[PDB]
Amino acid sequence: TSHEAGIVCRITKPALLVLNHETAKVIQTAFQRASYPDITGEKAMMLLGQVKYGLHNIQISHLSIASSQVELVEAKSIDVSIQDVSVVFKGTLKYGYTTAWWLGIDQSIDFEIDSAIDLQINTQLTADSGRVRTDAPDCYLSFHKLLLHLQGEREPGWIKQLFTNFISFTLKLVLKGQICKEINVISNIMADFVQTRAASILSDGDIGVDISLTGDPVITASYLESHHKGHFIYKDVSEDLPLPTFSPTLLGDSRMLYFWFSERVFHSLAKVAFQDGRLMLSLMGDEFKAVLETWGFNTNQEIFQEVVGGFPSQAQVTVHCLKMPKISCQNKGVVVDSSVMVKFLFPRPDQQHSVAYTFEEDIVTTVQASYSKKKLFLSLLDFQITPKTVSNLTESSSESIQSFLQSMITAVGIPEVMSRLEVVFTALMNSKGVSLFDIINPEIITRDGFLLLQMDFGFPEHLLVDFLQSLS
Numbered sequence: 202t203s204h205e206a207g208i209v210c211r212i213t214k215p216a217l218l219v220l221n222h223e224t225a226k227v228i229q230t231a232f233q234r235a236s237y238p239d240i241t242g243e244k245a246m247m248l249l250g251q252v253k254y255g256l257h258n259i260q261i262s263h264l265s266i267a268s269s270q271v272e273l274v275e276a277k278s279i280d281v282s283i284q285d286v287s288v289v290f291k292g293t294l295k296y297g298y299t300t301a302w303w304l305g306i307d308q309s310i311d312f313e314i315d316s317a318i319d320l321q322i323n324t325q326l327t328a329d330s331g332r333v334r335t336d337a338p339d340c341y342l343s344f345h346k347l348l349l350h351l352q353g354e355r356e357p358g359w360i361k362q363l364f365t366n367f368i369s370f371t372l373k374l375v376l377k378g379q380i381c382k383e384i385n386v387i388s389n390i391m392a393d394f395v396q397t398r399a400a401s402i403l404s405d406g407d408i409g410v411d412i413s414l415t416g417d418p419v420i421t422a423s424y425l426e427s428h429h430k431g432h433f434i435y436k437d438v439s440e441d442l443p444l445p446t447f448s449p450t451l452l453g454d455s456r457m458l459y460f461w462f463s464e465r466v467f468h469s470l471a472k473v474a475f476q477d478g479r480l481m482l483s484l485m486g487d488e489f490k491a492v493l494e495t496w497g498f499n500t501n502q503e504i505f506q507e508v509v510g511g512f513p514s515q516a517q518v519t520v521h522c523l524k525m526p527k528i529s530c531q532n533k534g535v536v537v538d539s540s541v542m543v544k545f546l547f548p549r550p551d552q553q554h555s556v557a558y559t560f561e562e563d564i565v566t567t568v569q570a571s572y573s574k575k576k577l578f579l580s581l582l583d584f585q586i587t588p589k590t591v592s593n594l595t596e597s598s599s600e601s602i603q604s605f606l607q608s609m610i611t612a613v614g615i616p617e618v619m620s621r622l623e624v625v626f627t628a629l630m631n632s633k634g635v636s637l638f639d640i641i642n643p644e645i646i647t648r649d650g651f652l653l654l655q656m657d658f659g660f661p662e663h664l665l666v667d668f669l670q671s672l673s
């Protein structure tokens with residue numbers, strides 16, 4: 202099978218196992234969110250006659266999941282199985298002897314309902330107009346115990362029977378209702394939030410990605426996989442253009458998380474980034490001086506002399522894209538074909554002696570990426586400079602100068618820009634909380650037409666309890 206998608210996410214069974222360690226905490230939340238209504242009636246009891254009962258203010262007093270387990274069910278769902286969840290409820294029982302008026306005042310006894318349940322939640326994933334939706338119509342409960350204990354172990358002779366032969370069943374059924382409802386909601390809340398926070402990651406200012414699902418996620422026995430458009434939005438405008446073709450053989454099932462990106466996604470990025478005016482750099486005096494020193498050079502060398510020349514504080518440089526850069530995915534790495542304009546201005550006393558060179562050129566660079574120590578690492582694999590129109594703007598012009606400047610673009614130019622990019626990208630990752638998850642041995646792979654992100658993750662046992670508290 203093939204899919205039409207710009208971006209594809211694969212979350213494998215190994216990852217779900219790590220996520221299941223937190224299942225208990227989530228099932229807890231559903232129980233705390235449920236609305237247990239008052240159970241009331243007025244039945245005729247053996248010998249006592251009419252009795253006006255009421256089990257009031259049903260609240261959870263204790264919760265404890267024994268063992269939880271996940272299981273991907275081929276072309277269907279996620280079968281989450283919870284065992285021996287010990288739930289203890291608190292309340293006040295209110296009753297009155299109606300027909301036996303001589304039996305004195307009505308009573309209020311505090312009670313504890315002690316249950317133990319087994320749960321099966323079969324969660325089916327669908328694409329609700331680009332958004333990922335959760336559905337668990339198949340939600341099951343198995344009660345081992347459901348004992349009612351009253352304060353002081355009081356019993357006139359009707360409570361226990363009225364509980365077992367009436368309240369037991371109804372309460373059990375109400376409980377399933379409320380639990381499977383609140384699971385279904387919290388399930389959706391996660392999915393919407395996860396998606397929303399993912400678009401928040403993939404977006405900055407007027408630039409944003411379109412993660413609309415290109416169809417219902419795929420469930421197999423080894424993984425769960427979603428397929429998205431990956432169109433870049435600029436200033437709330439998107440072009441719904443023909444989608445690339447994706448093969449689910451290009452992705453494994455060993456790693457926890459797999460990400461597949463068409464080169465068309467990097468191309469939309471170049472389009473938007475370029476058009477937003479993001480693709481430019483300007484350096485002045487002290488900063489320009491620092492940049493050369495950063496790339497290991499002493500500004501007071503015989504070479505750096507006739508250039509700056511005497512007044513380096515006023516020496517300026519500007520690099521900008523003349524056209525949208527051509528980003529391509531190859532096996533050898535990421536290749537960026539960019540057409541730049543490097544303008545050099547070195548002022549002297551008189552504007553006649555001031556050195557001003559404008560290098561109009563195409564710089565092709567094969568870049569390779571890495572993630573280590575919560576930083577993005579870009580490394581130059583191969584490059585090529587093809588000058589187009591190298592113009593001089595004063596009489597202070599020579600081929601030694603022209604070569605010197607051309608080299609500065611090569612030797613310092615490319616490495617500084619490459620650095621600034623890894624700085625700028627890592628910045629965002631942190632600014633969108635990527636630096637919060639334990640990203641275990643990630644691999645950034647490059648292939649002809651696409652790029653892969655293969656990673657295992659350590660889930661932060663705090664990050665859930667954070668979102669989990671932000672509900673009420």
Ligand SMILES: CCCCCCCC/C=C\CCCCCCCC(=O)OC[C@H](COP(=O)(O)OCC[N+](C)(C)C)OC(=O)CCCCCCC/C=C\CCCCCCCC
Nearest residue numbers: 403404405408467470471474479480481482520539621625
């Ligand atoms: C298109 C990617 C660029 C790489 C190809 C171009 C190669 C270079 C071409 C020409 C060189 C001339 C330009 C030289 C300046 C660039 C270097 C730079 O100095 O800075 C990177 C700029 C930001 O310039 P600035 O004036 O705004 O910042 C100020 C920057 N300072 C703080 C460092 C001073 O580059 C950007 O903005 C672009 C990045 C904006 C993307 C963020 C938008 C949200 C979308 C996605 C999030 C991440 C997606 C990743 C996963 C999906 C795969 C695509």
Ligand SMILES: *[C@@H]1O[C@H](CO[C@@H]2O[C@@H](C)[C@@H](O)[C@@H](O)[C@@H]2O)[C@@H](O[C@@H]2O[C@H](CO)[C@@H](O[C@H]3O[C@H](CO)[C@@H](O)[C@H](O)[C@@H]3O)[C@H](O)[C@H]2NC(C)=O)[C@H](O)[C@H]1NC(C)=O
Nearest residue numbers: 553557591592593594595596597598599600601602603604
């Ligand atoms: C850019 O620099 C030119 C000189 O630099 C040299 O040529 C570049 C093409 C490049 O190879 C660079 O590395 C070299 O150092 C400037 O051109 C010069 O301009 C002068 C004034 O027009 C000119 O002079 C005389 O020219 C004729 C012939 O000698 C006389 O008849 C006339 O009266 C002038 O006195 C000089 O010859 C000319 N050089 C060349 C090779 O043509 C160019 O103007 C400069 N650009 C700017 C905008 O300043």
Ligand SMILES: CCCCCCCC/C=C\CCCCCCCC(=O)O[C@H]1CC[C@@]2(C)C(=CC[C@H]3[C@@H]4CC[C@H]([C@H](C)CCCC(C)C)[C@@]4(C)CC[C@@H]32)C1
Nearest residue numbers: 492520535537566568570572610613614615618619622643
């Ligand atoms: C004295 C000196 C001054 C002189 C004037 C200077 C002259 C300079 C002249 C020209 C400048 C042009 C030369 C520079 C060319 C730049 C080339 C250049 O660096 O292009 C690269 C830019 C970044 C990127 C798009 C790329 C490749 C890989 C991409 C990345 C792969 C994965 C990355 C994920 C976001 C993170 C996954 C890790 C996860 C957290 C686990 C992703 C998509 C980030 C972006 C890159 C190509």
Ligand SMILES: CCc1cc(Oc2ccnc(N(Cc3cccc(OC(F)(F)C(F)F)c3)C[C@@H](O)C(F)(F)F)n2)ccc1Cl
Nearest residue numbers: 208210212326333395396398399402412418426427429460
């Ligand atoms: C930033 C991660 C990401 C999310 C994408 O869009 C969506 C939209 C909806 N669901 C998903 N899922 C994948 C996923 C995995 C890991 C993290 C993540 O987003 C997040 F970083 F925001 C999370 F940590 F909060 C999303 C989930 C989808 O596969 C599923 F399971 F619901 F079917 N991705 C598309 C690309 C990328 Cl790189």
Ligand SMILES: [Cl-]
Nearest residue numbers: 308355356357
């Ligand atoms: Cl009594």
